Amino acid sequence: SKDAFTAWNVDRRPIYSRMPKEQVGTSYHDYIATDWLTAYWDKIFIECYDKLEDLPRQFDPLQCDEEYLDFLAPLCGWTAPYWSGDYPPESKRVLLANSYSLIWRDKGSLTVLSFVLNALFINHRIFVPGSFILGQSQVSEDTLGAAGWEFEILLPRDYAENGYEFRLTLKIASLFSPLWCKYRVRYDNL
């Protein structure tokens, strides 16, 4: 009739340590068969106890194991094309961590799309077409302008055209850029 703390954390024999001990000579603890028979069950119970102890950790995407990213994806709202088993696990962690705080909350914003592209390890620049570009437009004669519902995703020359990065960027833009906006994936002219 001993406390759970000593049986589970000190003895680590939650079954054997509870067997009666008082009558020395003729008691369960006086015979080693009692220790041998219950060893496996104590071992199993301690393994399950450690698993249950680490369970709250497993629901943190930054801290959980890779076996739980797919299990937590529906909780974060990631099903359908928005999710993929081909995604690298670190990208999965980053996307799951900021789902309710940044991704779904502000979906359609430039920050959300840029964050999703960066999470999948795609260097990119979001460029809204205009008649005045800071790099080269001359103040004396060039004019001010804006595109409206148009923008473009410029990628570095390191990637191959219509390769992995281009088509992944197209998929991400289709999933996260507003539908009425006209977008084009392109090579960065810089």
Binding site: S1, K2, D3, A4, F5, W8
Partner: protein, 151 residues
Amino acid sequence: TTQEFLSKNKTIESELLDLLIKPNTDDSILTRNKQAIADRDLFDIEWEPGQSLNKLATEYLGDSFAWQIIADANGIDPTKEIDIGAGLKVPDQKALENSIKKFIVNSPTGKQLISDAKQSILNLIGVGDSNTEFSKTLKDCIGKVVNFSFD
């Protein structure tokens, strides 16, 4: 065929199919312990050397498996250590029955009195299935043959 629609502000066809997220507390793992025993119904004991929840359940509640109630009455993880001299609250035996809240539920069949409490007390009261009527037990065993799938 096509129907040009412009942006609006407040429509009732959208109120018809509007709110979806519903924060209802229904029976789940995180609602089993909503109900709390009144403070006037408990005893305020002190933790002393040689004490365990099994002993407290035996002396005060008369049953060794009643410790789940005591821990549920204290928010205590049993496998964690209780400091020496720390205070605990032990439920009375005779005062455990007044934590059972009875209310009337409405059904298309008819009014039904329903017991409500923390799930530990519900399990302890229904121990041995004495409270439930035999018709309920027979109902759950009516479907003995269980469909299984084969691979």
